[PDB]
Write a protein that binds this DNA or RNA. Structure first.
Ligand SMILES: [Mg+2]
Ligand SMILES: [Zn+2]
Lengths: 138, 83, 71, 99, 124, 184, 208
RNA sequence: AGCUAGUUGGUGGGGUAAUGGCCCACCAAGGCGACGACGGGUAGCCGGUCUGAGAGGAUGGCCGGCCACAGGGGCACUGAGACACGGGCCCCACUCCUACGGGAGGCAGCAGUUAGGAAUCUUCCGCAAUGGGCGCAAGCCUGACGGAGCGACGCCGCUUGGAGGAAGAAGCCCUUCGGGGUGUAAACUCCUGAACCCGGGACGAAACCCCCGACGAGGGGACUGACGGUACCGGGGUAAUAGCGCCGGCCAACUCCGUGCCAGCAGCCGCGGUAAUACGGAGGGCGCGAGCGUUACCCGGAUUCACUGGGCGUAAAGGGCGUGUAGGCGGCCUGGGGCGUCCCAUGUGAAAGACCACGGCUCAACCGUGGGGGAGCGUGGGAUACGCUCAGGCUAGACG
């Protein structure tokens, strides 16, 4: 059984980033969609869309990629260097307003699931509401 | 019973007294109910002694029976004086 | 300080004993545990049970001595 | 504010007494994960009005017996005996691993 | 592994091995020297190394190393035990602290006197 | 510092003039018999004096000790291989002015093949340390004027060491005369 | 307790002039100039490459010597600096300077730091009314030091004043050369002090 | 790994200030347990402290609270309150007297004695301050406490001089014989002046008391010092204790003699068997300094029990597999409930500390004042993204 969906999605994204494929296709969820939107806003992905592969609702994700690095190891540069599902199921981490992480000292982002919706670290700080630290993104 | 009394803290030869509200059967350093004021015998500071008046009055009303020195201090401050 | 209060007595090797050490029956008295000289080891002088060797006994415990001279 | 608790009636095997399973979900003080952790409370029922497999509201009260410090306030919902069954099964299992 | 596992059983906290049984973690135990003798050290090292079988205030019959250029120790000598191993010697975990009771200071030390309990020399 | 002074009559004395026997309490160590008591202005000075005395005595004692195992080649051998077996004994008396007497008496009583040895001689009560020492050495604990403490006595009984308690010097001497033995 | 004993030896050990006597430590006599190498035998020897720790340690020693303080005290000061917010090095330096003796030295009250300390000890130095006799006296900014009432007519002090008559004082300091007075104004920053020490290294040394 | 027989519940009563199996009678047969009972060991607990980047980890000394015991055990009495540290009764254990029938005892109060033991203070002065108790009051009592004594046992503060002063004395040490080192260090000139002596001299102590005012507020009066002739000030006034560790790499700092796998050192690698930067000494250095090192424990480094933050083909490590119970965990959508989760507010989170600010003791330690913070925990309101739960549906999992 697919035991965590959000985490799975994140993993897929990571894989895509590693492989230099322009677009991947993850199963449909509202939470997932919101997360994707947030990511897009941040700039971590090129965009997202919802489609239907076979007879199942699906989410296409446009991966953003850095310009081609000239010379040795000629791969383009990565935008999503690292993702981590922090609030792992049966471990599930929750933070207050004071314990909101400034991950990579303002450069990397965490995404928080909150009473006020799924939202960014900065936004959370502004609004003054703690919640579920779903994912570390940098 | 309940007493307004002076709690010694500080150093040797440098005493400091807490004008305080506490039970009679207690350590002269012990778990007191409330810190109402403070007093330095050595008069070393300009604001050498100070007690909050209203609280003291309230305590008195309730029935806090002060120690003699404490009473004197209170009087000096201006608690027992009424108009 | 360096205290040379050591007995330098002759003895016949009798028993093949442990840790580069040979029970040597002394002419001063008993068979002890007296171990090889480092010099001897360096030179690889092999000793058999039946050599008339010089033993360096330290008076603190006559149990242990030292096989000094080459045979 | 007396301690008000939610739990199921697991045992009516004694007169005037209901046994109540109160399940509290607290996070682990170090590992940050929630443990669904249970405790049994013996509650006073002056009528035997309450029965095997009822979820009830249990109030912290003045004692009636040695570890019977709870009054039964009201019945919340009656007939979710599944939990009770589970508890029973657990108990049965407990018998198994002795020798 | 899994946090759940930890929750179930927990991390078995390290019961740190007590490296010296001079009882209680006592810094210094006074002992009666039963028999003082000399010892062959180890495979990499060779010397007639000075030792004393010392019995203790605790009721412990141990072997104890004597530092210092020649001991003074008798057969029913009153001693104070340091502890702190010797890499050469088998069964031996204790220094004898020189400069106390019946172990007098090492004669003609002038540099590292503190460890061996010898008093300041009178200068000219 | 003087804590208590008490005459032979059994009375508490705060002041004692020249020429009266007082039970003076307050000495950190048990002083020797016929020791001259002296007055000091302060404590530090007294301490200093004591230290000086110790230095005088102890160094000399050490020196005396050091000129005994001179030769270690042959002399040591002679002195390690012992023909006439010795008996060890550790004494505890009531006063300083009896222990010494006892020692004097028993120093003569040594002509036999078995030669008596004093390893520890102090005034006062026997203890578990003493028992331990005895166990280590195979020694006898003898007491004059001092009764054994209950715990100590019990320890002596169970561990298997010689415990002795006496009323007269003569009795002690007699007991000692049995300890040399003969085997045949 | 002080260091006490041979002074310019320490300077020699570091290899940079430390000014631990004032005069002579200014003239061709500090031993920096006549001989520039470390003391004792292997001072004139081949100088080996020092370890990372070692350099830092040396720097720290240099600093301490320059300020003439016991190690424990220095450590305490460092700790205090760390506790306070800002620039843990510059702030630390400032705090050190705020030591009364150092301030006195700066104001030209005495030509050497040890000398200054001695002066302070012997009741010759007054901080706003009271003669203060402990060099560990920490001065908070905008505060007045003066040569004491009964020490104003002593020769050494006069000489010192003469020496500092003409030559200017640090921007955190002001001195009344007429009446043997000296206000400590600003708290001395690092930029004000062209000290040979690098505080960073010291900090690093302290860390572990 | 099962434990339980007043044990779990009841009815009635007793007992309590009060509930209750606290106790008893009678009925019932339960109760707890692997979410770790019962058993063994261990251990007063915490506010804290030490450490640590933090999370944690260890510890619970002093100080503050609470518990518990006053030789061991048992039990009541009196009172507001004890099952009563310097009350009681009783048995035992032990010490102490006995005219042998019997009584006396209890320092885990301060001091002290011993004994254990590595090791721990004075049979100190005082009711002056604060507090206690009694008293109308004076006042009496107070080993609470205030202080003094001893111990570098901690921590902090200062002294052991400063300024000159050789292209370099002696002494000692090396040298390639020139020289170098000790080292401006000394000597010596100048200057200051801990100690020390005199002269004074406290703050802490203004009240309770008396009188006027009504014995109220208020006004005046007076006494009252263990510390202590101390602190501290004013004058004088001596140049006036430096020690310990280490010096091969870690790790700061090197040469020579002596020694020859010996004597030794060592925390670890290991040094030592004839030129030892590792041993003994000497010079020289370096670290600290009235201290320094050794030992013991604790934490750290040790992300060597890994929550933050380790792993498991071959290193230590996947059980031999299957089915399966507890347990843990869980697809998508819509709606509620709002347990978790977040938040806002409040209450608590005592004081002392720790942190920030200022202030006192000539600084600092120490202390004082104020402030903030502070996990957690209750109460009231809110939020519904995410778990949880209820309800409805779906078809990607799974089953047929
Ligand atoms: Mg020899
Ligand atoms: Zn110089």
């Amino acid at each position: 059984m697919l035991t965590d969906p959000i985490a799975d999605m994140l993993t897929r994204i990571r894989n895509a980033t590693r492989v230099y494929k322009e677009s991947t296709d993850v199963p449909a969820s509202r939470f997932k969609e919101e997360i994707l939107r947030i990511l897009a806003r941040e700039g971590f992905i090129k965009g997202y869309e919802r489609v239907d592969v076979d007879g199942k609702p699906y989410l296409r994700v446009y991966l953003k990629y850095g310009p081609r690095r000239q010379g040795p190891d000629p791969r383009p540069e990565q935008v999503i260097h690292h993702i981590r599902r922090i609030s792992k199921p049966g471990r599930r981490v929750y933070v207050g307003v004071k314990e909101i992480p400034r991950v990579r000292r303002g450069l990397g982002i965490a995404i928080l699931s909150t009473s006020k919706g799924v939202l960014t670290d900065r936004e959370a700080r502004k609004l003054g509401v703690g919640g579920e630290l779903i994912c570390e993104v940098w | 019973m309940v007493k307004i009394r002076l709690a010694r803290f500080g150093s040797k030869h440098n005493p400091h007294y807490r004008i305080v509200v506490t039970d009679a059967r207690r350590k002269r350093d012990g778990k007191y109910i409330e810190k109402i004021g403070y007093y330095d015998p050595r008069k070393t500071t300009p604001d050498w002694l100070k007690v909050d008046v209203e609280r003291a009055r309230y305590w008195l009303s309730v029935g806090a029976q002060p120690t003699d020195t404490a009473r004197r201090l209170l009087r000096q401050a201006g608690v027992f004086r009424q108009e | 300080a360096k205290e040379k209060d050591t007995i330098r007595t002759e003895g016949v090797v009798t028993e093949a004993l442990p840790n580069a050490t040979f029970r040597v029956k002394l002419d001063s008295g008993p068979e002890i545990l007296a171990y090889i000289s480092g010099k001897m080891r360096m030179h690889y002088i092999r000793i058999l049970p039946g050599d008339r060797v010089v033993v360096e006994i330290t008076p603190y415990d006559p149990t242990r001595g030292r096989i000094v001279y080459r045979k | 504010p007396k301690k008000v608790l939610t739990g199921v009636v697991v045992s009516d095997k004694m007169q005037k007494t209901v046994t109540v399973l109160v399940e509290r979900q607290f996070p682990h003080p170090l590992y940050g994960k929630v443990i669904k952790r249970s405790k049994k409370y013996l509650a006073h029922d002056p009528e035997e009005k309450y029965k095997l497999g009822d979820v009830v509201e249990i109030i912290e009260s003045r004692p009636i017996s040695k570890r019977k410090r709870f009054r039964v306030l009201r019945l919340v919902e009656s007939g979710r005996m599944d939990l009770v069954e589970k508890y029973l099964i657990r108990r049965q299992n407990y018998e198994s691993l002795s020798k | 592994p899994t946090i759940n596992q930890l929750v179930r059983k927990g991390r078995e906290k390290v019961r740190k091995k007590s490296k010296v049984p001079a009882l209680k973690g006592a810094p210094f135990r006074r002992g009666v020297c039963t028999v003082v003798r000399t010892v062959t050290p180890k495979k990499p090292n060779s010397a007639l190394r000075k030792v004393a079988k010392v019995r203790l205030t605790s009721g412990y019959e141990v072997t104890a190393y004597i530092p210092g250029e020649g001991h003074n120790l008798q057969e029913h000598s009153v001693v104070l035990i340091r502890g702190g191993r010797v890499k050469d010697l088998p069964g031996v975990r204790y220094h004898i602290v020189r400069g106390v009771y019946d172990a007098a200071g090492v004669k003609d030390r002038k540099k590292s006197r503190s460890k061996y309990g010898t008093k300041k020399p009178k200068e000219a | 510092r003087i804590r208590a002074m008490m005459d032979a009559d059994g009375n508490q004395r705060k002041e004692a003039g020249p020429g009266s026997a007082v039970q003076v309490l307050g000495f950190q160590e048990l002083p020797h018999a016929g020791d001259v008591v002296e007055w000091v202005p302060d404590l530090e000075a007294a301490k200093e004096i004591a230290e000086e005395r110790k230095e005088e005595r102890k160094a000399r004692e050490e020196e005396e000790k050091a000129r005994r195992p001179r030769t270690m080649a042959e002399l040591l051998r002679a002195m390690q291989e012992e023909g006439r077996k010795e008996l060890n004994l550790i004494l505890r008396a009531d006063t300083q002015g009896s222990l010494e007497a006892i020692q004097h008496i028993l120093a003569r009583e040594s002509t036999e093949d078995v030669k008596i040895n004093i390893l520890l001689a102090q005034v006062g009560a026997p203890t578990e340390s003493d028992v331990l020492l005895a166990q280590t050495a195979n020694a006898a604990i003898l007491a004059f004027g001092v009764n054994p403490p209950g715990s100590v006595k019990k320890k002596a009984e169970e561990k298997g060491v010689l415990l002795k308690t006496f009323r007269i010097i003569y009795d002690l001497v007699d007991e000692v005369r049995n300890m040399v033995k003969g085997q045949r | 307790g002080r260091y006490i004993g041979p002074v310019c030896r320490l300077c020699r050990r570091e290899g940079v002039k430390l000014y631990l006597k004032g005069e002579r430590c200014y003239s061709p006599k500090c031993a920096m100039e006549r001989r520039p190498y470390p003391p004792g035998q292997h001072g004139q020897k081949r100088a080996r490459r020092p370890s990372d720790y070692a350099v830092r340690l040396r720097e720290k020693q240099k600093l301490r010597r320059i300020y003439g303080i016991s190690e424990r005290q220095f450590r305490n000061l460092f700790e205090e600096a760390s506790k306070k917010k800002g620039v843990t090095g510059s702030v630390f330096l400032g705090l050190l300077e705020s030591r009364l003796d150092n301030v006195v030295y700066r104001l030209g009250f005495a030509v050497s730091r040890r000398q200054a300390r001695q002066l302070v000890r012997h009741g010759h130095i007054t901080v706003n009314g009271r003669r203060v006799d402990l060099p560990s006296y920490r001065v908070r900014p905008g505060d007045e030091i003066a040569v004491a009432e009964k020490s104003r007519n002593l020769e050494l002090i006069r000489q010192n004043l003469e020496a500092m008559k003409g030559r200017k004082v640090g921007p955190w300091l002001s001195l009344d050369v007429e009446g043997m007075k000296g206000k400590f104004l600003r708290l001395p920053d690092r930029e004000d002090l062209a000290l040979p020490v690098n505080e960073q290294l010291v900090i690093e040394f302290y860390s572990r």
